[PDB]
Amino acid sequence: MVKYSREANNPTKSSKAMGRDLRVHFKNTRETAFAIRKLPLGKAKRYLEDVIAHKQAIPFRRYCGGVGRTAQAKSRHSNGQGRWPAKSARFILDLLKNAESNAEVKGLDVDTLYVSHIQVNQAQKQRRRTYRAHGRINPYMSSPCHIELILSEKEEPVKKEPESQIAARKA
RNA sequence: AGACCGAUAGCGAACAAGUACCGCGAGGGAAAGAUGAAAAGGACUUUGAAAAGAGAGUCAAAGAGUGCUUGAAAUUGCCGGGAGGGAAGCGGAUGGGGGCCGGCGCGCCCCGGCCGUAUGCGGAACGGCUCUUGCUGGUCCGCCGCUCGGCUCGGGGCGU
RNA sequence: UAUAGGGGCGAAAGACUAAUCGAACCAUCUAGUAGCUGGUUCCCUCCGAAGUUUCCCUCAGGAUAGCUGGAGCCCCGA
RNA sequence: GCGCUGAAGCGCGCGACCCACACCCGGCCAUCUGGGCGCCCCGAUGAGUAGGAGGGCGCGGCGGCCAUGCAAAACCCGGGCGCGAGCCCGGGCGGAGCGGCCGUCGGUGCAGAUCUUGGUGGUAGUAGCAAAUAUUCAAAUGAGAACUUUGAAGGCCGAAGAGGAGAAAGGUUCCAUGUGAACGGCACUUGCACAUGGGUAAGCCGAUCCUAAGGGAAGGGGUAACCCCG
RNA sequence: AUGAAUGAAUUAACGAGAUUCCCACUGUCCCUGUCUACUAUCCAGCGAAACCACAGCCAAGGGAACGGGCUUGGCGGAAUC
RNA sequence: UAGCAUGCGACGCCGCCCGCCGCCCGCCCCCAGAGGCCCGUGCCAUUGGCGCCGGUCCGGCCGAAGUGCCGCGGUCGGCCCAACGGGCGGUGGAAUCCUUUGCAGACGAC
Numbered sequence A: 001m002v003k004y005s006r007e008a009n010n011p012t013k014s015s016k017a018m019g020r021d022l023r024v025h026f027k028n029t030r031e032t033a034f035a036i037r038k039l040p041l042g043k044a045k046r047y048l049e050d051v052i053a054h055k056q057a058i059p060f061r062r063y064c065g066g067v068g069r070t071a072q073a074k075s076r077h078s079n080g081q082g083r084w085p086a087k088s089a090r091f092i093l094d095l096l097k098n099a100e101s102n103a104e105v106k107g108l109d110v111d112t113l114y115v116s117h118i119q120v121n122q123a124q125k126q127r128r129r130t131y132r133a134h135g136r137i138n139p140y141m142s143s144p145c146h147i148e149l150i151l152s153e154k155e156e157p158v159k160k161e162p163e164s165q166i167a168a169r170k171a
Numbered sequence B: 001a002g003a004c005c006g007a008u009a010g011c012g013a014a015c016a017a018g019u020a021c022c023g024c025g026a027g028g029g030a031a032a033g034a035u036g037a038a039a040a041g042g043a044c045u046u047u048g049a050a051a052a053g054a055g056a057g058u059c060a061a062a063g064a065g066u067g068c069u070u071g072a073a074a075u076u077g078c079c080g081g082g083a084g085g086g087a088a089g090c091g092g093a094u095g096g097g098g099g100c101c102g103g104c105g106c107g108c109c110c111c112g113g114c115c116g117u118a119u120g121c122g123g124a125a126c127g128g129c130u131c132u133u134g135c136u137g138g139u140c141c142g143c144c145g146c147u148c149g150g151c152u153c154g155g156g157g158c159g160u
Numbered sequence C: 001u002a003u004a005g006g007g008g009c010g011a012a013a014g015a016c017u018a019a020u021c022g023a024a025c026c027a028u029c030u031a032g033u034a035g036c037u038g039g040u041u042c043c044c045u046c047c048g049a050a051g052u053u054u055c056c057c058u059c060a061g062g063a064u065a066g067c068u069g070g071a072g073c074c075c076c077g078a
Numbered sequence D: 001g002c003g004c005u006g007a008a009g010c011g012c013g014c015g016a017c018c019c020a021c022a023c024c025c026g027g028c029c030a031u032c033u034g035g036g037c038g039c040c041c042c043g044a045u046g047a048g049u050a051g052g053a054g055g056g057c058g059c060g061g062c063g064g065c066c067a068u069g070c071a072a073a074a075c076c077c078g079g080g081c082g083c084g085a086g087c088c089c090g091g092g093c094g095g096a097g098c099g100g101c102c103g104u105c106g107g108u109g110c111a112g113a114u115c116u117u118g119g120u121g122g123u124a125g126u127a128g129c130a131a132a133u134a135u136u137c138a139a140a141u142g143a144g145a146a147c148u149u150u151g152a153a154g155g156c157c158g159a160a161g162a163g164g165a166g167a168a169a170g171g172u173u174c175c176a177u178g179u180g181a182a183c184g185g186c187a188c189u190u191g192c193a194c195a196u197g198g199g200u201a202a203g204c205c206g207a208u209c210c211u212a213a214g215g216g217a218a219g220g221g222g223u224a225a226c227c228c229c230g
Numbered sequence E: 001a002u003g004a005a006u007g008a009a010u011u012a013a014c015g016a017g018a019u020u021c022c023c024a025c026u027g028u029c030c031c032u033g034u035c036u037a038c039u040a041u042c043c044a045g046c047g048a049a050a051c052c053a054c055a056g057c058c059a060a061g062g063g064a065a066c067g068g069g070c071u072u073g074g075c076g077g078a079a080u081c
Numbered sequence F: 001u002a003g004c005a006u007g008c009g010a011c012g013c014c015g016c017c018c019g020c021c022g023c024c025c026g027c028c029c030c031c032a033g034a035g036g037c038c039c040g041u042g043c044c045a046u047u048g049g050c051g052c053c054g055g056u057c058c059g060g061c062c063g064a065a066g067u068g069c070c071g072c073g074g075u076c077g078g079c080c081c082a083a084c085g086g087g088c089g090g091u092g093g094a095a096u097c098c099u100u101u102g103c104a105g106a107c108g109a110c
Helices: A026-035 A042-053 A086-106
Strands: A014-023 A114-122 A129-132 A136-139 A144-152
Touching: A014 A086, A026 A086, A026 A114, A026 A144, A042 A086, A086 A144
Parallel strands: none
Antiparallel strands: A014 A144, A114 A144, A129 A136
């Protein structure tokens, strides 16, 4: 959550974080959401720390065009495209760090949960242009991007407690 | 002043406008309005690479929070419904299922309740007509007397 | 630092006169003018075309009938 | 098309079937026949570009009549009517204006015009950021360091593919300190980005004085005059 | 359809002028190879335009006589580099 | 040479499976030049005394897979759910990555 996109949940159960108008590749930064995506805080961090490291790639389900492929897909099995876009990843890390912290302040459990909701939208595009040969003028602009992160005290443990009707086992 | 225009319109110009900007120069020349009743214009605390974020506070309203009334379209994300990795297309039409949703009395009898006209009183719009004028014919109300009855909202039974 | 627009300058190519030259650029006349191309925005009804003929510096147009259609007025025709 | 062959070919006869919006039949819309009480009914014909002729819908401001409004207009979603142009309602939003009838006005209706303007998607996380081979190892500082700064190592520049002094031109770009939204086609702690301060000192350098193609001031005269020769 | 200052002929020197021959030489060629460099490719970062009424299989046929799409036939597991 | 996406076989088979069954919830809907239950209550449907078919134990023939059938001795049964499934429940027995490389190689793959 912030002054809002799809929040939907409860304040007690969840924590909220947002990035605003970051200038990063929009297409790389969405995907970064798709892959994580239902997941813990600490594992996400480990996954992203891995991403920069080039340990784990972030699935490029949309976005094709010549991406570098199939080094591994890992989770997504195989699947050809993948890169490890470090800058968008670093920005998701500060977002997870905001969210984690907010969760902590709230008194949210160290155990507490997974990423209920992440979206990514193209905030705007910053304007800009560079001059070209033959007297012609071509825009080079940057895309601002907003990312919303919803942390929720239902998801990690909702999925343990109505894991019910045959269920629990690990436990 | 106005059957003018109302922010792509009206002047080029509602504002910092012949401004910003272009051309050696003559000359050319935009885009540019609106928080709120009141600044009450976001303390205090946590966090953070930065901004920002979280939580809270003000107000009828903050998706009223600063190019801040409303907030379409074109578009993006997430998500919901329909569908799906073996069968062919002007993307509709036509038929069918699924998905979604708004809408929802009569006849008779007994009890309770209320009132009554005809005639005498007492007040009054009317009428056919005549049309100077006049004659017969209204209706309801106010409310007592004298006979002699009905209605309506509900309840209970029966038959339709 | 001269020479300025049918003028200049040219060892003359129609070369060159601020990215513009078989006549610079600017602003104006000016909303030129186009028998040519394009476009011209709400519903319905009754009837429903012409692509032919003469004239015309006339044939990518005009013109005048021919073909149409409405609105009124009247009561034959194969 | 598969594709048949004493036929699913061909011909001569034949029987039954199929098949349109045609034709019939049922119910209904215009015009016309007309009829009958502002309204009802009988039957016929009835595609349509250019297009004539006629009835109607919607816009905006005006007047007379007639309302609506503390929850109006607008928007979004659906419900109802109307062939229909279009009318109407319900929910949410919005948070102040809005209609209807008649009679008028008219910057009065778009999908289009290599239409204008604005916004926005795909193109795409794609092209470019490639020829002097130029940095590398330690370290400083910093929230952050491949590109800021120190040292070492290694090169490159040579009439200046990167030395010194200057003309024009720029126009404060210089120095210092502090930053980092934008720039630098990337990072940035850096900078010729941003902000604030500060610096240029002439008797003996140059301007300045002179005069050179010429700009010419000065008759007279063309030219209204601008303007031009002398 | 040559021809004399619309110049004729002729001609040494000169020429990034037009044509031809020889020697020298050689990868132009027989006939291609290996190799360097920078690209390419992949990674982080930065990040564009043209263009876009249109879904987007082939063989035939048809049609304003040059079909990605009608018509009949035949094929196609998507997506991605 | 290519070729299981002709919608194939075989071999080898494994943080909890699955072999055999109680109880319930969805989809299609015979062989064959003619043939295919003895005494009862009860409108029904339920429900009770008591030769020919249907799962079965154990095995063979087309079968060479998928796939089926048919018999010597007996047992649970008669005169809903086959081909699929979807569970509440009882009893019972691996690979990608990684790291270093290549016979391989633009990435991925091998």
